Design a protein around this ligand. Sequence first.
Ligand SMILES: [Cl-]
Ligand SMILES: [N+]
Length: 134
Amino acid sequence: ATVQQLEGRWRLVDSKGFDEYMKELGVGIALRKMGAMAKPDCIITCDGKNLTIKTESTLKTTQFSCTLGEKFEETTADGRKTQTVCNFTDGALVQHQEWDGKESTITRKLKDGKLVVECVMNNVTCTRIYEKVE
Ligand SMILES: [Cl-]
Ligand SMILES: [N+]
């Protein structure tokens, strides 16, 4: 219902589809193996319309900040530089990425006290579930 409801440190507890989604992105084997193996934490913080999402692991550490509704240049973990925009719509944070004629979307929602992250590119989907670290 509100973006602030997504705030906190979250730890990955389940993943489905992520290897296939990275293959759709064209990520090479070194990076795909590290994504299959890392169990990162996701730390979400917000202040009004400003949002930061940090991903932390020994295998993988990255962060971006944005303002809801404002396009910005995002450097992704696999090294794309995308034009991204985040919006909070219908109780989910929606992150839309565009680069080189391609698009992908990541949604983040709270369900049963867990953070549910879904990604899609060209109908190839991933679903990752995180629980709060507290
Ligand atoms: Cl839903
Ligand atoms: N999977």
